[PDB]
């Protein structure tokens, strides 16, 4: 019992992590196989940020401008590209400690865990969520760029996320591993605000089941609602709509329960109406929603 | 910027994870050295469990009966002792991958990382902290007795806890690694019951500290307060009381702020009396009280 934000074991990934430097930048880079990857503003100045003309700027670039330290050992690089917003570096070495690895785009919602690392190496392991606006409320100081966000499945790491950028309001913007920035953010010093950060319904209603598996019970209530009636009080609130593919992911924790998705919905739905009026739910005064449906599972089966 | 409920990166400790089985109970291991450590309740049956003699049920056990796994490979035991609440399996093998280490007994409101095990695999890793009572809120299901908590210092991984049992409540209580239990609890099924789990003061005001590091600033008030004014109102709400020995730690954060500790006490006192109003600090709508100053350091600096 007890119920906890739990990120993945981060092992396999340290054992990825580069330090790369071009020029006076310095910043992290994941090595796979025999490429390093890392996000392309690693060739920029403070200068260059403002309006940076990637193109024009790799043109000044040679595979020797790129340091790429593993530990305390250079890496010597054969090769270079750029493929979106991230650089490819060829070394002449396959990382030896490569685990079996996907690249795979997440959809907002998901959750991944972080680790954070300055100068390629490791400081901290959180688990956060690509929210609805495509922006993460990560943890990240200056030289974090490049950390990398992951899930795992048994032996198989799915690289979903690398770190680029801070927005003016603290939140964070990044990549997948193919250079392709989430939502509309890019990779320049310029205002880019965030929209509308909606809370993700699917990830409060699968927290309030792991409620009722650890004893937290005192908020649901002798309701019921529809999809529809739920979905005119979850838009009030900024929270996502509710759809049947929803509905049908949360049908392992309804079973598990006994309690139907839409009586959880009526429980959420009097929740944000009410408020807590003092009290908490799994040690929080706030509805959670940094936990999936399969994260739930997950923790209260014990999957390695 | 941005401030998460961050573990330390787990790597070391995952290759230090081996599966310990005597008779039909499997539970964790720590393989340090030569040596792996466990918890004594291995050798116990379910029905053991209710009253316990381990000195006897012990002179039942050989060398062969504690069966050791590292991965999908057999550990040769060749020798056994009991410390306090643990068993040390000595076998004949060192682990390649033992990092440096020590083994620390914590005070109640340090925190550290868990690196939760089943079957000596690693499932997850999150953060946590002793409470005042001695208990700390984990995420455990059966088979994860053995599963360790601790502290990384660079390069040397401070092991302080091993998860042992579960209460009736909910919470968890474990020893450290020479096996005394934290707080009053015995290896033993039978009625436990934990003292009141007050705030951990200190911690809420690092994390405050940390809040307007990142920008959370409105709870800041025109106040000021004295210790003893400060610990009348922590009193009334089961927060531990301030020393000047906690002024003096949180040092360095008032330093980077410019705001005096006994100012932010007065900003907590008015937290405390007035509530947070629907308000969040760093997306909490409670006092955080799991990150101790140093972790506020740590993670606001980017120590690797
Ligand atoms: C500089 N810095 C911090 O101090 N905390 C950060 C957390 N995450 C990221 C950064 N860095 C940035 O955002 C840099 C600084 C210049 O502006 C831009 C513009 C676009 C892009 Cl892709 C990167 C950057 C951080
Ligand atoms: C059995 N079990 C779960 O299902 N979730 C647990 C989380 N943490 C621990 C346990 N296990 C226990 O607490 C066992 C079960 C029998 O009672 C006792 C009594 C004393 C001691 Cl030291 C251990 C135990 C858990």
Known sequence: SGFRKMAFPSGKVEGCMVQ????????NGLWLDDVVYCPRHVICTSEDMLNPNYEDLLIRKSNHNFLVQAGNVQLRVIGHSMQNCVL???????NPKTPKYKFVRIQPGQTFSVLACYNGSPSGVYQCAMRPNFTIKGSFLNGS????????????????????????????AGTDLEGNFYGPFVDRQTAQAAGTDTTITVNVLAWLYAAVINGDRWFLNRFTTTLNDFNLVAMKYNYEPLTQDHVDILGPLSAQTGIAVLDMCASLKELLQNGMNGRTILGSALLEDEFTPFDVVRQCSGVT
Chains 1, 2 share one sequence.
């Open 20 to 27: 790369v430097t071009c020029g006076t930048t310095t910043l």
């Open 88 to 94: 490819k570096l060829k070394v002449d070495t396959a």
């Open 145 to 172: 760029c490049g950390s990398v966000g992951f899930n795992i499945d048994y032996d198989c790491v799915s690289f979903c996320y690398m770190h680029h950028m801070e927005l003016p309001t603290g939140v964070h």
